[PDB]
Amino acid sequence: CGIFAYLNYHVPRTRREILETLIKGLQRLEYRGYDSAGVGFDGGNDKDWEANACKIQLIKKKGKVKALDEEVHKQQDMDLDIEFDVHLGIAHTRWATHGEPSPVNSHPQRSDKNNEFIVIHNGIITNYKDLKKFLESKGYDFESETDTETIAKLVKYMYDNRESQDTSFTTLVERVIQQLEGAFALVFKSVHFPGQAVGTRRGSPLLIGVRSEHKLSTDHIPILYRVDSTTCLFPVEEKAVEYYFASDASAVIEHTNRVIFLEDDDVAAVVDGRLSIHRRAVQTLQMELQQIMKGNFSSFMQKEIFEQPESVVNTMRGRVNFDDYTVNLGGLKDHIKEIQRCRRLILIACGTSYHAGVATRQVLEELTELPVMVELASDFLDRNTPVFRDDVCFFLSQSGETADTLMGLRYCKERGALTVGITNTVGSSISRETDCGVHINAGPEIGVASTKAYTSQFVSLVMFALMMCDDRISMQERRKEIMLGLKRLPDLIKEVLSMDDEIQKLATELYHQKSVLIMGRGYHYATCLEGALKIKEITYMHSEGILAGELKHGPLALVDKLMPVIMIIMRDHTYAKCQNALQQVVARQGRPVVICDKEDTETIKNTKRTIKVPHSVDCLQGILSVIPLQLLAFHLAVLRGYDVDFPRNLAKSVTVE
Amino acid sequence: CGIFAYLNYHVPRTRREILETLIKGLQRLEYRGYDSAGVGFDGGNDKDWEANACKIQLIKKKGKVKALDEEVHKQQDMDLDIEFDVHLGIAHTRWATHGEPSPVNSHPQRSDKNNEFIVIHNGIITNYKDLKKFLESKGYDFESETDTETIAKLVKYMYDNRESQDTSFTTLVERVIQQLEGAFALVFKSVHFPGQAVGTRRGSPLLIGVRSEHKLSTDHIPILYRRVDSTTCLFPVEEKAVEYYFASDASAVIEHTNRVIFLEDDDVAAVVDGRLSIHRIDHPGRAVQTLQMELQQIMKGNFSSFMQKEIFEQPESVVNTMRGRVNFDDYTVNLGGLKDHIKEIQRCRRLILIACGTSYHAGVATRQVLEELTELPVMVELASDFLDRNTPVFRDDVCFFLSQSGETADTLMGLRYCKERGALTVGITNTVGSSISRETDCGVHINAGPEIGVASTKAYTSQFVSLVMFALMMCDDRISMQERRKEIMLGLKRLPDLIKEVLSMDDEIQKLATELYHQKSVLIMGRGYHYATCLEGALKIKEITYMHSEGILAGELKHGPLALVDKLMPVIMIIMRDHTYAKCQNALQQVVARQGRPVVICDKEDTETIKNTKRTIKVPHSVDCLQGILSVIPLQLLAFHLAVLRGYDVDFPRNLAKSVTVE
Ligand SMILES: O=C[C@H](O)[C@@H](O)[C@H](O)[C@H](O)COP(=O)(O)O
Ligand SMILES: O=C[C@H](O)[C@@H](O)[C@H](O)[C@H](O)COP(=O)(O)O
Ligand SMILES: N[C@@H](CCC(=O)O)C(=O)O
């Protein structure tokens, strides 16, 4: 889900400039949820903007943001020309994991049939059922099935039983969160508090951006405890200021790079155009707009695939020195010594991030000599897996906010393990709560299906492995071999990308099929698993990854001349075993596509369809073998008329149950 | 693929009776699959059996054993009434590897046009190219494309170049195997050694059964290295009469006798003058042991298929797995196979379960309760990937090897890998005498009875129960776990009747089969204790029905796989009453929200889901760590019924190896 609100204080904006700012903000957040959207602004058509802050208009519609963008426009009642000197507008895109994605369930929610309080919520309230029964007895009627509505009907209940006639908007929100259980990121708007916003979070991201041509009164807002000119953030001499509430930074970078990342239970409140926190550091974001633009590509997923030569280079920047063959991950300098005294490595993650652990498990075992265990986070938790004080637990999460991965982290901390975060988002929960960690530095990933995150995690774990063995004489040559492979890896990725048209042709032969089996073993077990997941996610074909050594134990019965098959056969120590699996497939009349090395003349002669990739080091070849399957999934989705950036039934980053 | 030989020594038998015994032997060996079969026996119609010992007749044919039987009795020149006081007959079913199926490529292979030496073979001789060239240069002409013919020609080469006129049959065979490379089980017969048999193996099972109405000299045959007298071989004491049965599977011997000798690699067993000695190039020896197998255990009975039998007899196979091991009277578990090692095992620091296919799923299905009751790290590894990665193993690891057959190559090689690194090894097998049961430090026979069906059904549930019993042993000294142990053991007490209850819903499963009859895919979703149920059911439906069933971990749906859900994709979800119930309900709401209309396997009393879901398979509730046995059986039956509807033969393997090398 996504949160975005635009508060222009004494910065005249017409009702069109505002709605186009809310929609544009949701477009920056759409990748976090695109099942429905909605906006909440001030209604009325009075020239004097002051007489309009008592009327709240809600425009909510099912579908992506573009469905709401048209619903907002071509309306017969809203006059888009009213100039507002002060105005607050809130917006929200929803990932409807439950129920119907109807406008009634979309946000902003309301507290009554006159819109006295409207709230946009990211998260879950684990006790909304109890809150629902309490509010219904007092005389409140519910309309939607969402847990967010209980937050709107409750902020009004605290307002209908206040002690003084002018209790601050903060005090009302404070009494609400004290009754809410679970995680949430909230942004309130009320007719009684015109222009005033309140932003509180608990286990969910929520920052506040600020723009103003004038100087700001401070760069460290002091948190308060139940508010003068030496306490609030505001322009000194004048009042011109623009705020940007948002659950992510991509929705604010376009307007400003000065945000204030809140913290759990911090109740921010903009009053009279002054930001004050209740219960900070105005900082510059280290992000360029170009990082979240498609550039000259028609989709984010395509950009992020073809930019892997660059994102791989950025992952190694300032960390790999090829002149002297040294590896230094600054994030682990203070802990690498104690990590080596531990006795087991555990990798915990979900989805594609879990595959990154599978793809590097073997080389981690080789260079550390430690037992390495790779766990799906959801099953890790279900089994109450045993963890000990001398375990080193890695948590792979591009977003750094995945629910199951994050709960596994707190589980391992409680048991005394040493925790390490491999993330792509700075300031994320997983990056903060681990003892140490590494930012893979692949840049923002906007596509729902992870591509560069996978290859960057891959490289990051290999660099860690290289540190763990830099004192072993017997492993020096093996280290050099791997590092030379990394030096040559960016260009070899470019070579794979130059086969784009040859992949697209093979896709024209498969798009009509219902299933495809992707078979590999050893280093390329993860490759066939990740490729199957990618084809599932964006093409909707029933693709499954099968461990090649397991074919003879049952799954081979499914192969006939009609079943499409993709096999991975690389020139490593399992080559002969992979050739035997291939012969078993052919015996069953299978006609597979084989991803193989360019020099594998034997395979190239005896197979019609081959995808010939350049040879790298055996423990890096998985990066080159997966890219064709990224490209194949892309072209298949295009051939089938589907969107590669907005696959049905889900969104990016699972931060709730 | 199947070997059987019958040696009657001073037990008079007619030619008919001998041939009927050979045919019947091969019939017990068909379930493994084959493409041709043949028999070898003494020819000639001289009423005095002593003179017919120099004429070996062969009858080999491509096709089923039944066709071979018709060919046997369809011989106008053969008199089936001659009585033989001494005779050796050999039989074989072939699964072609070298040379296409044909009469010439069928066994027994011969050494010359006069059949001076014949041999039956299971396996592959790797160096059969080099051996064939050598024998050709010495003046031996080959007539088949099989690697086996090199064996028959080579033994005649050793005989032709023997140093003394009375070199033993054993010595010749020893010289043969010392030149062979690969895997083999062999039985030899020759006109120069009438009435004698030689059997040897390397990487392929070979056993010998024995029957006699007289007392036998010993029950422990001592090995002889390079004197054969009355103190070194097996024989009836006061009389000569005795019968011997060579076989590659005990299923072909059990109806005649339950006293067997399992041979080991590079053993050369010889019967000379009705006495059995074991040669090999304190004192080591081979035991004559008693098998608890019965002919009834390998017969369909009233069932129409072995798959159906082995599914519906699971209430009895579970009981057999627990017999003598669980005392419900006082809530105690005792696996006698671990008595001399349970102490060491409890001092180790990690459990590793290594297996393939459904046996691997048995480890996944019990990983959680093993972690709970042992409190040790439990790692479950697919044997093939375990080997590819050179996984780290240590002297304080306990490694379990799960294998119904006890012969799977990758599992066996994983075992030898762990033994070299000093780990304590444990075999969980269902086949006495198998390689994995022998080479492990200790083990448990799951005692489910032989599995004749192509797919693993009772083996999976018996492995399941066996690992639960081991877990119950590991925590028997913990005061805090007494209640939990009792709960689990009262679940085992009630499990046989709960299985019958599930099997009584067969009709409901058939209705589900008709719904999926025309479907090409189905997703099976579950988590926790029922992750293994999803994987195992998905594999069954793939293996038996040949449709694309896939197991999906429910907690992973929102990470990608949920994109496959729509109004057309068939989905089966498992929702049981355990600690993951709420999370499973959540996954169900996620599927329905995207137009999915899944079939739900749930508890009989889950009134909420039964009402909100159209088709539900309602199984009885049991302990959470045992429910996996009840939830997998409906998927066993579904695979069975779908296959029948589609006209498939569930007892037909299909899954063949690589193509035949014609050369
Ligand atoms: O293509 C699939 C997605 O990339 C998905 O599998 C993702 O990896 C997880 O849903 C969360 O992983 P992160 O925590 O790294 O975002
Ligand atoms: O339906 C499953 C098959 O029976 C197969 O997957 C089997 O489980 C493996 O081939 C391992 O065999 P073993 O258990 O005999 O080692
Ligand atoms: N390799 C031998 C025997 C194969 C077997 O049945 O095991 C052949 O093909 O004739």
**Within 10 A of A569 (CB to CB), how many other CB atoms are there?**
28
**Chain B residue closest to A545 (CA)?**
B550
Q: Are residues A282 and A300 in the same domain?
A: no
Positions of E strands within B95-160: 109-110, 117-125
Rounded Cα–Cα distance for residues B56 and B46 (Å): 13
Please give all residues whose beta carbon lies within 6 A of any atom in ligand 1, as ranges: A 350-353, 397-399, 402, 405, 449-450, 533, 537, 653-654; B 559-560
How far away, in angstroms, is A1 Cα from ligand 1 center? 15
Other Cβ atoms closer than 10 A to B54:
15
Clarify whether residues B27 and B170 are in a common domain. Answer: yes
Q: Is the CB of B146 inside a 6 Å radius of any atom of ligand 3?
A: yes
Domain span at residue B595? 505-655
Look at B558 and A654 and tell me if their CB atoms are within 8 Å. Answer: yes
Q: Are strands A241-246 and A207-211 parallel, antiparallel or unpaired?
A: antiparallel
Residues of chain A contacting residue B378, judged by C-beta atoms under 8 Å apart: 386
Dihedral class, residue B203 (left if φ above 0, else alpha if ψ from -120 to 50, else beta): left
Query: Which residues does chain A have within 8 Å of residue B307's beta carbon, measured at their own beta carbons?
Result: none
Task: Tell me: do B491 and B577 sit in the same domain.
Answer: no
The pairing of beta strand A418-423 with beta strand A391-397: parallel
Same domain, B359 and B239: no
Q: Could you confirm whether A1 is annotated as catalytic?
A: yes
**Domain boundary residue among A498, A520, A539?**
A498
Of residues B474, B403, B462, the one with CA closest to residue B434? B403
Same domain, B378 and B318: yes
d(CA A256, CA B586): 39
Angle between helices A621-639 and A476-497 (to 10 degrees): 20
Where chain A is broken, by preceding residue (C–N > 2.5 Å)? 226, 279
Q: Closest Cα of chain A to B35: distance in Å?
A: 16
Q: Are A242 and A7 in contact (CB under 8 A)?
A: yes
Mapped onto helix, strand or coil, the DSSP state of residue B501 is helix
Residues 6 or more apart whose CB falls under 8 angstroms from that of B304 comprise none
Given B274, B296, B318, which residue is the final one in a domain? B296
Q: Can you say whether residue A100 is alpha, beta or left, with left for phi > 0 and alpha for psi between -120 and 50 degrees?
A: beta
Structure tokens at A35: 């099942």
Min Cα–Cα distance to chain B from A546, Å: 11
Same domain, A583 and A454: no
Last residue of a domain, one of A289, A307, A325: A289
CB B126 within 8 A of CB B57: no
Place of tokens 């002091």: A222
Chain A residue at shortest CA distance from B551 = A544
**Exp. method:** X-ray
Same domain, A78 and A207: yes
Question: How many contacts, defined by CB atoms under 8 Å, are there between A and B?
Answer: 180
Residues contacting residue A634 through CB under 8 Å, at least 6 positions apart: A299, A301, A302, A305, A538, A644
Protein residue closest via CA to atom 4 of ligand 2: B456
- Would you say A353 is a known binding-site residue? yes
CA distance B642 to B517: 6
**Identity of the residue numbered A137:** S
Residue B342: both structure tokens together: 């349970």
State the CB neighbour count (10 A cutoff) for residue B444.
24
Residues A71 and A130 in one domain: yes
Same domain, A255 and A355: no
Which ligand approaches the C-alpha of residue A401 most closely?
A: 1
CATH number at residue B366: 3.40.50.10490
Phi first, then psi: give them for residue B649, nearest 5 degrees. -95, 110
What does B236-249 look like in DSSP terms, one character per residue? Answer: BSS---EEEEEESS
Residue B398 placed within a domain: yes
Locate the ligand 3 atom nearest the alpha carbon of residue B660 and give its number. 9
Nearest-atom number in ligand 1 for the CA of A534 is 1
CA gap A505, A513 in Å, rounded: 15
Helix runs in B330-447, H state only? 342-346, 357-374, 383-389, 409-420, 435-439
Same domain, A70 and A170: yes
Residue B115 falls within a domain, yes or no?
A: yes
| Among A542, A570, A572, A580, the residue to mutate for chain B (most B Cβ within 10 A) | A542
Considering only CB atoms, B563 lies closest to which of A365, A563, A648, namely: A648
Give one DSSP letter per residue of A5-45, joined into a string: EEEEEEEEEEHHHHHHHHHHHHHHHGGG--SEEEEEEE---
Q: Which residues contact B251 (CB under 8 A, 6 or more apart)?
A: B28, B29, B293, B298, B450, B452
| A32 alpha carbon, closest ligand | 1
Q: Which of B1, B233, B418, B602 is catalytic?
A: B1
Question: Is A460 annotated as contributing to ligand binding?
Answer: no
One domain, residues A161 and A19: yes
Q: Which ligand is nearest to the CA of A376?
A: 1
B78: domain CATH number is 3.60.20.10
Residues B265 and B355 reside in one and the same domain? no
CB spacing of B555 vs A404 below 8 angstroms = yes
B663 occurs within a structural domain: no
The verdict on a CB contact (< 8 Å) between B385 and A547 is yes
* DSSP at B165: T
Contact by Cβ (8 Å): A528, A568: yes
A402 labelled ligand-binding: yes
Cβ contact (<8 Å) for A537 and B561?
yes
- State which amino acid sits at residue B259: R
Q: Which residues of B touch A96 (CB under 8 A)?
A: 593
Do the bridges between strand A515-520 and strand A565-569 make them parallel or antiparallel, or are there none, so unpaired?
Answer: parallel
Counting the structural domains of chain B, the total is 3
Instruction: Look at residues B400, B415, B356 and name the one whose alpha carbon lies nearest to residue B382.
Output: B356
Residues of A in contact with B542 (CB under 8 A): 554-555, 557-558
- The alpha-carbon gap from B554 to the nearest alpha carbon of chain A, in Å, equals 9
Provide φ and ψ at B493, rounded to 5°. Answer: -60, -40
Whether residues A557 and B654 touch (CB distance < 8 A) is answered with: yes
- Strand A36-42 and strand A83-94: the pairing is antiparallel
Q: Which residues of A touch B455 (CB under 8 A)?
A: 554
> Between the CA of residue A554 and those of A531, A558, B356, B634, what are the distances in Å?
21, 8, 10, 19
Cβ separation B659–A378 shorter than 8 A: no
Tokens standing for residue A557: 């019965």
Query: B186 near B120, Cβ under 8 Å?
Result: yes
